[PDB]
Amino acid sequence: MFEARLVQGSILKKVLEALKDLINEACWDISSSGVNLQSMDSSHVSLVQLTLRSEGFDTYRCDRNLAMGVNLTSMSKILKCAGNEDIITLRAEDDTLALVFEAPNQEKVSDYEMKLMDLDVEQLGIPEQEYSCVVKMPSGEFARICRDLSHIGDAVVISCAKDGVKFSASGELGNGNIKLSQAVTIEMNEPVQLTFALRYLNFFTKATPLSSTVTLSMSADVPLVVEYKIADMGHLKYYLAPKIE
């Protein structure tokens, strides 16, 4: 028997809006430690990693470890039925997932039973390594940058140095250059210059409501890490394969 109560229903609503546009089906791994999700996209080019620590939930119980095959689109539709102030309860047994929406400002109780599915997908393991550059900046600033450069080109050249960070794009209309100065903080070991598809970055930036800040971890010839810390509850990480150069 699994039962997790989250007072901040919005968190789960936002988490699902951040995922649904990148992945349609993902396996939700439940354990005594908390909720874990690790899935790669349809184009096999980006990877999502969600971690919601049990300590982040008001109530958390997990008798047996579950691996629920969820259709993120269906779960999103269900979560859209939850009010922005609702207390969300997740309850599952070792066939379906039950979502209960307790409304604070009313005597209304919503109870949804979502059909699960069997997911035979590619499981990939990410070793936590050290990056040559780690940029921490306002999530909104980042989302604006990615959206802006999208009007100029398809790829973004992220150049990270001691001074600041630079994002550039080129297209048929001309070229663009956004230079940020060191709140923006840089934990650089070696300077890095990497090229990434803006298409994918703009899917990642859908996690913007989750955090006031975003962190970009870069090391040469390795995927980018765009992390959104949830609220001491956990995080949501997006990995993006760099462009062959």
């Binding site: 080019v45 990995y239 394969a241 760099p242 462009k243």
Partner: peptide, 11 residues
Amino acid sequence: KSGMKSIDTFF
């Protein structure tokens, strides 16, 4: 101009 390597190639 540039293409990408699969995320599997890194993981």
